[PDB]
């Protein structure tokens, strides 16, 4: 029939922008109730939206206990959440949209500064290579909703990066509007790939520009899944012989103080038993390795940092509880970038919070790639509460970003924790 263009108002007047977002609020109001309008509005004012794209992130890193205690207060934060959620399943793109992603350094995981010459207005190509080097077909997760903003008033001068990106037609969208701003509002929990980055010159302003894809990494956040371990270990134990099976059951009920000591030990004094049963474990963990991509959990305190066990982000001020910044810096900025050994065998789960260990401050978000030696634990009497995946022993992760959270511990008890994004690289040699 008529070729279809892409939602593109890069260079185009704002007049026209502000007028087809009004037009595009008006029809997706159409489809809204009351609470799913008064929730969307609200995101009018720019310090409600940050609190609730916070909030947002923090509620997939908090347990489901905490989450249940939460409905059942009549959490507006929460039920705004869901309306946001709800109001955005209704309404769904007939075309592609080109805009700009709200990601800063920060959340692309760099901790180094770009403008780096002429009085901090220029950028070198050297910077370029590096930021390059390090981000280039990384996958950065947006756990908030994502605003694509619609043309270049949506540009924060003071931001050095600019991610450009592309999103496909049938994707849920709402649209939200300011004085000088159009953008749209997408689900949770997407994710940028950066695919290339150029230094670009904008109304006499320097920046990295980044064309990203937006993509979904495989993730089940406080959720989990018991159907993905049913669905790709439901014939696991049918595969293990004999002697594989004992090994694995001793590991998982009796033996597993002792071989941990032991390989944390470096394996001395020399134990040909725990020898034997290792090496059937890891054979065991290689009969069916990770079949596809995805994110497994790991919360931790503070002794694997060196830091104490006890360590915490949280500060008091005028008897409130808030988070110590410096503190957060400190660690964001010396621990990405640094390689995480783990010399046993080593337990995750899809599940990101776990009731038991919901007071711990340091989640490793584990990127579990297509072929890493582990198993989900399905199929073994005791474990279906777990959703507990398995990594071989010596599995070394590298950190490449650390987004802090404010977790709900209870209905009185929030605590500053952070999300360690970490993807495997190879078994530090030992």
């Given at each position: 029939?008529?070729?279809?263009?892409?939602?593109?108002?890069?260079?185009?007047?704002?007049?026209?922008?502000?007028?087809?977002?009004?037009?595009?609020?008006?029809?997706?109001?159409?489809?809204?109730?009351?609470?799913?309008?008064?929730?969307?509005?609200?995101?009018?004012?720019?310090?409600?939206?940050?609190?609730?794209?916070?909030?947002?992130?923090?509620?997939?890193?908090?347990?489901?206990?905490?989450?249940?205690?939460?409905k059942e207060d009549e959490n507006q934060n929460l039920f705004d959440v869901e309306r946001i959620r709800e109001a955005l399943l209704k309404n769904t793109l007939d075309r592609d949209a080109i805009g700009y992603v709200n990601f800063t350094p920060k959340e692309l995981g760099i901790n180094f500064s770009i403008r780096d010459v002429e009085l901090d207005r220029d950028i070198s190509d050297e910077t370029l290579d590096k930021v390059r080097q390090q981000i280039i077909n990384q996958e950065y997760t947006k756990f908030s909703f994502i605003s694509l903003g619609?043309?270049?008033?949506?540009?924060?001068?003071?931001?050095?990066?600019?991610?450009?990106?592309?999103?496909?037609?049938?994707?849920?969208?709402?649209?939200?509007?300011?004085?000088?701003?159009?953008?749209?509002?997408?689900?949770?929990?997407?994710?940028?790939?950066?695919?290339?980055?150029?230094?670009?010159?904008?109304?006499?302003?320097?920046?990295?520009?980044?064309?990203?894809?937006?993509?979904?990494?495989?993730?089940?956040?406080?959720?989990?899944?018991?159907?993905?371990?049913?669905?790709?270990?439901?014939?696991?134990?049918?595969?293990?012989?004999?002697?594989?099976?004992?090994?694995?059951?001793?590991?998982?009920?009796?033996?597993?103080?002792?071989?941990?000591?032991?390989?944390?030990?470096?394996?001395?004094?020399?134990?040909?038993?725990?020898?034997?049963?290792?090496?059937?474990?890891?054979?065991?963990?290689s009969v069916k390795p990770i079949p596809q991509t995805l994110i497994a959990y790991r919360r931790v305190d503070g002794i694997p940092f060196d830091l104490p066990s006890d360590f915490s982000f949280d500060k008091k001020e005028n008897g409130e509880i808030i988070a110590d910044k410096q503190k957060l810096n400190e660690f964001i900025d010396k621990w990405t970038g640094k390689e995480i050994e783990n010399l046993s065998f080593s337990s995750t789960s899809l599940k990101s919070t776990p009731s038991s260990f919901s007071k711990r401050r340091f989640i490793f978000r584990l990127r579990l790639s297509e072929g890493a030696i582990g198993a989900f634990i399905y199929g073994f009497s005791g474990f279906q509460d777990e959703q507990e995946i398995l990594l071989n022993k010596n599995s070394t992760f590298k950190i490449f970003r650390i987004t802090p959270i404010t977790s709900i511990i209870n209905r009185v008890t929030k605590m500053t924790q952070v999300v360690i994004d970490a993807e495997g690289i190879q078994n530090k040699e030992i």
């Open positions: 029939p008529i070729i279809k263009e892409p939602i593109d108002f890069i260079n185009k007047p704002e007049s026209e922008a502000k007028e087809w977002g009004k037009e595009e609020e008006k029809r997706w109001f159409t489809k809204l109730n009351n609470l799913e309008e008064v929730a969307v509005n609200q995101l009018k004012n720019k310090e409600y939206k940050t609190k609730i794209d916070n909030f947002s992130t923090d509620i997939l890193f908090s347990s489901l206990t905490a989450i249940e205690i939460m619609l043309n270049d008033n949506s540009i924060n001068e003071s931001v050095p990066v600019i991610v450009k990106t592309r999103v496909p037609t049938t994707f849920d969208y709402g649209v939200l509007n300011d004085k000088e701003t159009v953008s749209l509002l997408l689900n949770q929990g997407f994710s940028i790939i950066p695919e290339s980055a150029i230094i670009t010159t904008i109304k006499g302003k320097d920046y990295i520009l980044i064309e990203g894809s937006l993509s979904q990494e495989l993730d089940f956040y406080n959720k989990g899944s018991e159907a993905w371990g049913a669905e790709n270990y439901g014939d696991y134990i049918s595969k293990l012989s004999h002697e594989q099976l004992g090994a694995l059951e001793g590991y998982l009920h009796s033996d597993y103080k002792a071989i941990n000591s032991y390989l944390r030990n470096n394996r001395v004094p020399n134990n040909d038993e725990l020898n034997k049963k290792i090496e059937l474990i890891s054979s065991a963990l």
